C-alpha cells in the first residue's frame, strides 16, 4: 500500500530514532487523504504488522489523540517527539557515581545519548555492554560507543550472574514499557534484573514518553505474541526496577500508570 514505503523511508533514512516516529509521521501523512477513526485503527494494525511494540503503541495513542484541527496538533506532537531526546539527556546523566561501573544492554538510541551526555559532563566510569544474542545485538553498541573513549568490555550474557559484583549501577535500554510498572526488552534483560535483586544493588531503567504501552502481562506467556516474531522480548514482575526515566522526568515504578490513567489507558 501507500503507507509502508514512507514508513520504511522513516525507519531507514534518519538514524536518530526507532520505528516509533516512523509510525507517527507515517500515520500523520495518512491524513492527507469522526469519519477516520476506525480507518486509523485498521491502518495502524496494518502498519503495526511489524515485530515491534512501539509502532502499535504509537497507533493506539493516535486513536487516543483523536479522542482542519489536528494537523497543527500533529506538528506540535512531532515537536513533542523531537526535543525529548535532549530533555532526557540533560535530565538523566547525573545519578552516575564518579567511579562507578555501568552495565548496559543492546543498541538503543537512548542510553547512547545519555552516556554521551555523561561524557559531556566528564565523569570517570566504565560501561559494560552485554551481548544479548538471539543475534548480534551488543557488539554494535560496543563499537559505536568505543567510538567515544570509554573502556567497553562485553561480558557474556550468562556471565552476567558473576559480573554483578562490579556493577553498582545497571542501566538498560528502552524497548517497551507497561502499566504494571515494568519494561519489556530483549531476552537477556530479565536475568540481570533477577540477579540484581539478589545483589542488593540498584537497577536503573530509562524509557521514553510516547513508547507507553497499555496492555498488561502477569506471568510468562502473558507477553503479546505479535511481538515474538524461542522468544524475542521477555519480562516478569516489576518488584525491583528501581527508577524509570521519561520526557516527564524522574519517575518511580508506579507513575507510568499515572501518566496512562491521566489519559485513560
Amino acid at each position: 500500500k501507500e503507507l509502508i514505503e514512507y514508513f520504511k523511508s522513516q525507519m531507514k533514512e534518519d538514524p536518530d530514532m526507532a520505528s516509533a516516529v516512523a509510525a507517527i509521521r507515517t500515520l500523520l501523512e495518512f491524513l492527507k487523504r469522526g469519519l477516520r477513526a476506525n480507518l486509523t485503527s485498521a491502518i495502524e494494525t496494518l502498519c503495526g504488522v511489524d515485530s515491534s511494540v512501539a509502532v502499535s503503541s504509537g497507533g493506539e495513542l493516535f486513536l487516543r489523540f483523536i479522542s482542519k484541527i489536528m494537523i497543527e496538533r500533529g506538528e506540535l506532537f512531532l515537536r513533542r517527539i523531537s526535543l525529548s531526546r535532549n530533555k532526557i539527556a540533560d535530565l538523566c546523566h547525573t545519578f552516575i557515581k564518579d567511579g562507578a561501573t555501568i552495565l548496559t544492554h543492546a543498541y538503543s538510541r537512548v542510553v547512547l545519548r545519555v552516556l554521551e551526555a555523561a561524557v559531556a559532563a566528564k565523569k570517570r566510569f566504565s560501561v559494560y555492554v552485554t551481548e544479548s544474542q538471539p543475534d548480534l545485538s551488543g557488539k554494535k553498541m560496543a563499537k559505536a560507543l568505543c567510538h567515544l573513549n570509554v573502556p567497553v568490555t562485553v561480558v557474556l550474557d550468562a556471565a552476567v550472574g558473576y559480573i554483578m559484583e562490579k556493577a553498582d549501577l545497571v542501566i538498560v535500554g528502552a524497548e517497551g514499557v507497561v502499566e504494571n510498572g515494568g519494561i519489556i526488552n530483549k531476552i537477556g534483560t530479565n536475568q540481570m534484573a533477577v540477579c540484581a535483586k539478589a545483589q542488593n544493588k540498584p537497577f536503573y531503567v530509562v524509557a521514553e514518553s510516547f513508547k507507553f504501552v497499555r496492555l498488561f502481562p502477569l506471568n510468562q506467556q502473558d507477553v503479546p505474541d505479535k511481538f515474538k516474531y524461542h522468544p524475542w522480548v521477555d519480562y516478569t514482575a516489576p518488584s525491583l526496577i528501581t527508577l524509570l526515566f521519561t520526557d516527564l522526568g524522574v519517575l518511580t515504578p508506579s507513575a507510568v500508570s499515572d501518566e496512562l490513567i491521566k489519559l485513560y489507558l
Binding site: 502477569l218 514482575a237 500508570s257 499515572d258 490513567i261
Partner: protein, 357 residues
C-alpha cells in the same frame, strides 16, 4: 442512646482493646423493643448481625443500605433543627449502635462517607420530601453504577484476562469471586476451580454450591492442610473485603497464610475489589482493628467427651479466635477493578481520581 453488650468468659492478655460478645445474650434483651428510641431498621440489622445472618462481602453494605433507606425515606422532618443537619448527627447513634452490635466492615464506612457527602450536597433551600427523593435517586444511581457496573466491567476485563485451563483457587465467600467464575465459565471456557475454607465458619459453601449449580468442577481442602495444594495451583482468586492504601488487601482468617504460601511459588495472587472498596484507614499489624467473634464456638464433637464445655472451672485456660486479617503489599500484586488492571502499590492514585477532582 443505646447500652452495650456484656463480656462472656475470659479474654487473652493481648486483645484488651477489643471487646468480645456472645450470641446467647444480645442487645435487645432490654432496650426499647418498639424501636423509636432508634429507627426500627437499625435494631433489625443489629440483631440479625448478632446471629451473623448477613455476613457477606458487599452483602453487608446492601443490607445496611436497605436499612438506612428505610430510615431516610420515611423520615419525619422536625422544625427548630435544620433541613439537612439533623440527619447526620442523629446517624451517629446508628453506626455507633452497629459498632456496638458487631463492628463494621470498611464497606459500610465507605457507604457512610458517600451518603454523608450527598446529604451535605442538598442543604436547606429545598423542601424536605423531593430533596429526600433526590437523595433516593442519588443513592440508587450510586449503588447501581458502582456495585453493578463495576461487577460487569470487571467481568468483561477478566474475561479478556482469564483463558483456557487456568486452574484457579478461591478462599470462597463473596458475591464477586464466584460471580467472575460463573460469568467467565458460561462463555465457552474451561477451568477446574477449587475452593478452600476454614474452621469454624466452615464457609466455602455459597461459592462451591453456586459453582456446582452453575456446573463447574470443584475440589475442596481446608487451610489447616493448605500445603497440599502447594504445587498444583495455577493462579488464585482472593476474595478480599476491603483494600487499604498501602496496597494491602483485607479479608478473613483464611486468607492470611494462603497468601504467603502462594507467594512462595510465583503463582500470581489475584484479588478482586472494585472501586467501592478503596479505603483510607491504613493498618500494618494484625491485632490493631480486628474484631473477635463468640469465643466458645470452636468446640469438638468426640462422642460427648468434649474438652471445651466447662472451661471456666480450672484456673488459667482461655480461648480466642480472630476473624479478619491484613496481608502485606509485597505478596498481593494484581487487583481486579474498573479502569484497568491496576497493580498493588499504585492503588490510591485511583482513589484520588474519583474523589471530586
Amino acid at each position: 442512646q443505646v447500652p452495650t453488650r456484656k463480656d462472656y468468659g475470659s479474654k487473652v492478655s493481648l486483645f484488651s482493646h477489643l471487646p468480645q460478645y456472645s450470641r446467647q445474650n444480645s442487645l435487645t434483651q432490654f432496650m426499647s423493643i418498639p424501636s423509636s428510641v432508634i429507627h426500627p431498621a437499625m435494631v433489625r440489622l443489629g440483631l440479625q448481625y448478632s446471629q451473623g445472618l448477613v455476613s457477606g462481602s458487599n452483602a453487608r453494605c446492601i443490607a445496611l443500605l436497605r436499612a438506612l433507606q428505610q430510615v431516610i425515606q420515611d423520615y419525619t422532618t422536625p422544625p427548630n433543627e435544620e433541613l439537612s443537619r439533623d440527619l447526620v448527627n442523629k446517624l451517629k447513634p446508628y453506626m455507633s449502635f452497629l459498632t456496638q452490635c458487631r463492628p463494621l466492615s470498611a464497606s459500610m464506612h465507605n457507604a457512610i462517607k458517600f451518603l454523608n457527602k450527598e446529604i451535605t450536597s442538598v442543604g436547606s433551600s429545598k423542601r424536605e420530601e423531593e430533596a429526600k427523593s433526590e437523595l433516593r435517586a442519588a443513592i440508587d444511581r450510586y449503588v447501581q453504577e458502582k456495585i453493578v457496573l463495576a461487577a460487569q466491567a470487571i467481568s468483561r476485563f477478566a474475561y479478556q484476562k482469564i483463558s483456557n485451563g487456568d486452574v484457579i483457587l478461591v478462599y470462597g465467600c463473596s458475591s464477586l469471586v464466584s460471580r467472575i467464575l460463573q460469568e467467565a465459565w458460561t462463555e465457552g471456557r474451561r477451568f477446574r476451580v477449587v475452593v478452600v475454607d476454614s474452621r469454624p465458619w466452615l464457609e466455602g459453601r455459597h461459592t462451591l454450591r453456586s459453582l456446582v449449580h452453575a456446573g463447574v468442577p470443584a475440589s475442596y481442602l481446608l487451610i489447616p492442610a493448605a500445603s497440599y495444594v502447594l504445587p498444583e495451583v495455577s493462579k488464585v482468586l482472593l476474595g478480599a473485603h476491603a483494600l487499604l492504601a498501602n496496597g494491602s488487601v483485607m479479608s478473613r482468617v483464611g486468607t492470611a497464610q494462603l497468601a504467603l504460601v502462594a507467594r512462595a511459588h510465583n503463582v500470581p495472587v489475584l484479588v478482586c475489589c472494585e472501586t467501592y472498596k478503596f479505603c483510607e484507614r491504613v493498618q500494618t499489624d494484625a491485632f490493631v482493628s480486628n474484631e473477635l467473634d463468640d469465643p466458645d464456638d470452636l468446640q469438638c464433637k468426640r462422642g460427648e467427651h468434649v474438652a471445651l464445655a466447662n472451661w471456666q472451672n480450672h484456673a488459667s485456660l482461655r480461648l480466642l479466635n480472630l476473624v479478619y486479617d491484613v496481608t502485606p503489599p509485597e505478596l498481593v500484586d494484581l487487583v481486579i477493578t474498573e479502569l484497568g488492571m491496576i497493580p498493588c502499590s499504585s492503588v490510591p492514585v485511583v482513589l484520588r481520581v474519583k474523589s471530586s477532582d
